């Protein structure tokens, strides 16, 4: 997250870190056994880390649970990043409490202008490279589909939306991928892609979660 703020320990209780020997992506806990992330985050040997603030220090609220299975969206295209969504099942159910909690799925899509909270342990610099140890947060509005398409000609599908600031300086970044965009307590987006980070006229692009609620529910119901 570039241009954001320190969230505060366990203030984003649905935020997960995906770990394969090191943090490599975010995710969102959607019930005691399932995490939503980006398909582009797919790899084998994932350990889901819940209750994290400092990802380099054991602070007392962590739950580390190995993934038992991953399900990339049937229509994920890695070239265009269309349908950039994946489900991860935990080997055991997470113990839910105030600091480890699921986030609600939307029942309808969010509109341009809605303020959302975007979070992660990704790069904090738009030019350089600096990775934070503690969870970073950004409040950002959803942008109109027209401005999103104007920013990224030929690249925005109906499964994507833009959020952030066309002026630059405030954005998600490398390492935030797969993490949440939460709007009025609903998971509306997944950190998916962008051109650089926090660049002028290049806002963040997010997977449009409301399109996938049917697929998520039915997938969970049979797995
Ligand atoms: N600018 C962003 N919001 C973003 C998100 C995820 C990855 C990347 C970099 O390729 C950029
Ligand atoms: Ca920790």
Question: How would you portray this structure in words?
Answer:
The longest helix is centred in the C-terminal third of the chain and has 9 residues, at about 215-220. About 5% of the residues lie in helices and about 30% in strands. It folds into two domains: about 1-10 and about 105-210, Beta Barrel (Thrombin, subunit H), CATH 2.40.10; about 15-100 and about 210-220, Beta Barrel (Thrombin, subunit H). A seven-stranded antiparallel beta sheet has the order 1-9-8-11-12-13-10. The radius of gyration is 16 Å and the shape is globular. By secondary structure, the protein is mainly β. It has two helices and 13 strands, in the order E-E-E-E-E-E-E-E-E-H-E-E-E-E-H. Calcium ion (CA) binds near residues 52, 58 and 59.
Tell me the name of the CATH class of the largest domain.
Mainly Beta
Indicate the proportion of strand residues.
25-35%
Tell me, briefly, the overall form: globular
Side by side, the strands of the main sheet go 1-9-8-11-12-13-10
The number of helices is 2
How much helical structure, as a percent, in the residues? under 10%
- H and E string: EEEEEEEEEHEEEEH
- Major β-sheet profile: 7 strands, antiparallel
Number of domains: 2
Bound molecules: 3-formylbenzenecarboximidamide, calcium ion
N-end to C-end Cα span: 33 Å
Name given to the CATH architecture of the largest domain: Beta Barrel
Oligomer: monomer
Number of strands: 13
CATH fourth-tier homologous superfamily of the largest domain: Trypsin-like serine proteases
CATH topology of the largest domain: Thrombin, subunit H
Catalytic activity: Preferential cleavage: Arg-|-Xaa, Lys-|-Xaa
Domain Peptidase S1: 1-221
GO molecular function, one term: endopeptidase activity
Keywords: Calcium, Digestion, Disulfide bond, Hydrolase, Metal-binding, Protease, Secreted, Serine protease, Signal, Zymogen
């Amino acid at each position: 997250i570039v241009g954001g703020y320190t969230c505060g320990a366990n203030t984003v209780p649905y935020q997960v870190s995906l770990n394969s020997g090191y943090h490599f992506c975010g995710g969102s806990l959607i019930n005691s056994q399932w995490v939503v992330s980006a398909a582009h985050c797919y790899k084998s040997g994932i350990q889901v880390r819940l209750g994290e603030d400092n990802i380099n220090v054991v602070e007392g609220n962590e739950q580390f649970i190995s993934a038992s299975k991953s399900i990339v969206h049937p229509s994920y295209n890695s070239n265009t990043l269309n349908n950039d969504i994946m489900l991860i099942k935990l080997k055991s159910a997470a113990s839910l409490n105030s600091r480890v909690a699921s986030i609600s799925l939307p029942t309808s899509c969010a509109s341009a202008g809605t303020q959302c909270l975007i979070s992660g342990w990704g790069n904090t610099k738009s030019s350089g490279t600096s990775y934070p140890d503690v969870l970073k947060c950004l409040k950002a509005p959803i942008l109109s589909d027209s401005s999103c398409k104007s920013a990224y000609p030929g690249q925005i599908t109906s499964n994507m939306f833009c959020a952030g600031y066309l002026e630059g300086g405030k954005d998600s970044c490398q390492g935030d991928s797969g993490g949440p965009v939460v709007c009025s307590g609903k998971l509306q987006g997944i950190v998916s892609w962008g051109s650089g980070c926090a660049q002028k006229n290049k806002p963040g692009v997010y997977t449009k979660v409301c399109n996938y609620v049917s697929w998520i529910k039915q997938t969970i119901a049979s797995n």
